[PDB]
Symmetry: D3
């Protein structure tokens, strides 16, 4: 299985590292996938590019 | 509902803000979603990364 | 530009048609795309497949 | 944050429920997001639609 | 590398099989990926769900 | 048809040009689409953002 994660830009390499590790373990537990068959990848979305209720994350002071 | 929007790179912050605002309004009008539940995010695609009938926008730009 | 829209399953043909029409109008207004260059497509997500804070819409439906 | 999960079709309701809760917990842990800010959705991909080394999952006898 | 393909619903298992084979070979040629590291997967989009210029594929008689 | 391509970041312009032309040709062959109906776009994924068996591509020394 594959997991595509979308995050607002600015998380650290460490947090990214924990996303990949924890979501890999989650996918292993939930569906029994061999660890080495699990791909997780992350899109960093700029704050001008992410909207919640019609207002950008940049406007919302995220 | 969620909308993921793909644009060739280079739109300004205000152009992207108008995408967030107007696509959120479109979704509220079309499906009656509460404004605050609507998420829009935008991917900026480099010119060298976007193909139209086998030729990248960068090559069609020249 | 392209828009990929995610909706919980069960919208009608006309609801989906209004998403196509209104998001295409939104994109033309926001980025000045020619109407004929705009592509919208919609994914219907099963209730059992859509999670909001760790609980599926199917479980929150009951 | 958002997580978009791709699985070969055929996972049961319970398996998806485990994907939703475990991935959501993973993301809370990894980036310090509140429960209500994590969205997880799953795409079930038909066996004839999923390719691994140029062969379908159906083809590989799954 | 990964390739996600979007097709209007109705292509045959054979055409799907050729998509997976040919796009796998394309990704091998273009980027030198070991054949067995190449995943290709296909989304069949219903004709009520795909829009071109604000009009559904179903309306367009596709 | 549309093809969305995910690559670890770092492919040169020429490699992407080969991804665009070869994938487009692949799709023309496989489903009998005219050249001008095939859209191909590429996402460059940072090495720290791409996970394989719970480890980043950076981590795996790429």
């Amino acid at each position: 299985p594959f997991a595509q994660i979308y995050l607002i830009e600015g998380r650290t390499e460490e947090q990214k590292r924990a996303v990949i590790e924890k979501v890999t373990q989650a996918m292993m537990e939930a569906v029994g996938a061999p660890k080495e068959n699990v791909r997780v990848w992350i899109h960093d979305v700029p704050k001008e590019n992410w909207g919640i209720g019609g207002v950008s994350a940049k406007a919302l002071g995220r």
